Scaffold this active site. Structure first.
Site, PDB file in Angstrom:
ATOM      1  N   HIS A  41      66.344  93.551  33.360  1.00 48.36           N
ATOM      2  CA  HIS A  41      66.205  92.437  32.427  1.00 48.36           C
ATOM      3  C   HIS A  41      65.730  92.875  31.040  1.00 48.36           C
ATOM      4  CE1 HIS A  41      63.186  89.576  30.694  1.00 48.36           C
ATOM      5  NE2 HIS A  41      64.251  88.794  30.677  1.00 48.36           N
ATOM      6  N   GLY A 143      54.943  88.611  30.874  1.00 49.79           N
ATOM      7  CA  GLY A 143      54.675  90.011  30.580  1.00 49.79           C
ATOM      8  C   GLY A 143      54.433  90.885  31.801  1.00 49.79           C
ATOM      9  N   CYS A 145      56.402  91.268  34.462  1.00 51.72           N
ATOM     10  CA  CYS A 145      57.626  91.861  34.996  1.00 51.72           C
ATOM     11  C   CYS A 145      57.513  93.382  35.059  1.00 51.72           C
ATOM     12  CB  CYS A 145      58.803  91.443  34.106  1.00 51.72           C
ATOM     13  SG  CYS A 145      60.351  91.829  34.846  1.00 51.72           S
TER      14      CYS A 145
END
Ligand code: U88
Ligand code: U88
Ligand code: U88
Ligand code: U88
Ligand code: U88
Ligand code: U88
Lengths: 306, 306
Positions: A41, A143, A145
């Site tokens: 991502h 944040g 991830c």
């Protein structure tokens, strides 16, 4: 004495955490040897997530588009490749802190420790279980991830989870470290949702044995049950079925306490049918299901890691 | 999303743990710079704990009586001195992994992380609170003496707790790192016992605010209360009194949620008088009191450490 939801010591994982930035996206990555693993991502930006073609997005990217920061040291990216839903960023520097590690995929009902991180910096550590519906009930903000989940055995770190997203009920979905999602989730913004869950029956029984080891006996009774008659009652309260293999792995705890597995099932049946009547077990007013039979043995024995 | 009992990352403390052996006694010690701190109980052996005179026991000891092991490396002891209930073993080697640290004593109601250890080897990490009665509800087996509790702020480790003993109800007692016990306990085997506890009211309120931040609103109501009328009801259920300073520190959480502190007290009053009616708050059927106002802000903000 005492029994707590206990996480593994996190030092070996702390020394692997880094920050990855591309475009206007920043998240956490995992640096082992000369590879940084992170969610794919990161190559998306504020227009590239409704229906992204990541292969097409990735071939447009230059190595210098990838800023990797290990503390206040900048790592230079020399290659990249995509493996399912994770990126593998080849860097010119091998991590001198790389522990012995494995990539393993866990089963629903199994537990692990999460090291929550922001901007490559560790924030906290806590213990989770993989729910039967392949979500996890975590604590994650924007944040986080790329934070990982893991187990430790002697000196080996078995990485099992990389965090990717929040579902609309506030639970979390992620992948194993080969980039394959746990459960029927995607790394896009769709209408996807958790779907129904059940309680992990074998783990509840393990925790009842923990309570007996610790001095609680109030919930025991004179009765026994067959394995069929238990599952009948167990299906009725949204509990997972119990198998002979589950009975077999509860054997050590049964022999340590002198309570046959099927006698403990009779206890659970009565607790399900009557409630706790204002009592508690191990400081809980709810039947707890995030301790495996192995967690209980590990905690009650004092097993350590090096 | 989500809210979990979260411990600090433990790596900085892991690199300070060592094993201390004297006679037939082995326990954990804490190596900072060229000093190893451990419980003075290590100079006792199976006859020297009913009424030990430690000064008299210690002057009979030779430096070579002290085997300190840091991993598979042997540290040589070159001096020793006793400070209250801890020993300070001067070794010839400064710990290259010494973080920035402080020795601080905490107040009842304050929280910290425990790194449970056996034979100098870390076993698990979990979060605890100092109860109003100066005990802690831990998880500790034979051999865990000398494990420490701590907080972290940016890059500074504030050590607050060294574990010494189990009380007959299964709770735990220990010292600060200057060797002064928390509460009216001694490092002998007497008949000492915990004495009565209360629930930490300001922390319960912080956790109710956490629940609101997280999406739970079911327990709110239309009512308000004065601070006196609340404490009246609060004393009745064994809760600690709430002060204007407590009200002041809950200010940030009140402003973030738009719920005045005294309106939240009205919620708690009704929950105390009526129960939960089969509902849960943040996955608990009990009012939880081991999160401080600062823990909630820290977790809900994503604060990290370096
Ligand atoms: C596992 N739970 C409690 C133990 N104890 O010995 O007090 S072991
Ligand atoms: C844990 N022990 C050995 C490993 N290895 O990859 O060799 S992992
Ligand atoms: C990591 N953060 C957000 C993701 N997403 O798929 O939206 S992955
Ligand atoms: C603290 N608890 C929950 C948060 N959230 O934003 O989902 S912050
Ligand atoms: C945390 N910051 C600085 C310390 N010191 O002893 O200087 S502790
Ligand atoms: C550390 N282990 C046992 C102690 N005691 O005072 O008995 S201190």
């Amino acid at each position: 004495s005492g029994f707590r939801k206990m996480a593994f010591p996190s030092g070996k994982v702390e020394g692997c955490m880094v920050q990855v930035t591309c475009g206007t996206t920043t998240l956490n990555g995992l640096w082992l040897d000369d590879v940084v693993y992170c969610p794919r991502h990161v190559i998306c930006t504020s227009e590239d997530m409704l229906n992204p073609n990541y292969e097409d997005l990735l071939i447009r990217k230059s190595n210098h588009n990838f800023l990797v920061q290990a503390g206040n040291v900048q790592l230079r990216v020399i290659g990249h490749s995509m493996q399912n839903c994770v990126l593998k960023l080849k860097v010119d520097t091998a991590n001198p802190k790389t522990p012995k590690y494995k990539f393993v995929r866990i089963q629903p009902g199994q537990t692990f420790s999460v090291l929550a991180c922001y901007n490559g910096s560790p924030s906290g550590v806590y213990q989770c279980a993989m729910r039967p519906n392949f979500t996890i009930k975590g604590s994650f903000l924007n944040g986080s991830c790329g934070s990982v989940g893991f187990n430790i055995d002697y000196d080996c770190v078995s990485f099992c989870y990389m965090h990717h997203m929040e579902l609309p009920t506030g639970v979390h979905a992620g992948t194993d470290l080969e980039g394959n999602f746990y459960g029927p989730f995607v790394d896009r913004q769709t209408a996807q949702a958790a779907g129904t869950d059940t309680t992990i029956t074998v783990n509840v029984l393990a925790w009842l044995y923990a309570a007996v080891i610790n001095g609680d006996r109030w919930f025991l009774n004179r009765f026994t049950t067959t394995l069929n008659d238990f599952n009948l009652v167990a299906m009725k309260y949204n509990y997972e079925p119990l198998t002979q293999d589950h009975v077999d792995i509860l054997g050590p705890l049964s022999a340590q306490t002198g309570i046959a597995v099927l006698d403990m099932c009779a206890s659970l049946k009565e607790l399900l049918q009557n409630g706790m009547n204002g009592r508690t077990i191990l400081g809980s007013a709810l039947l707890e299901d995030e301790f495996t039979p192995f967690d209980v043995v590990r905690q009650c024995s004092g097993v350590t890691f090096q």
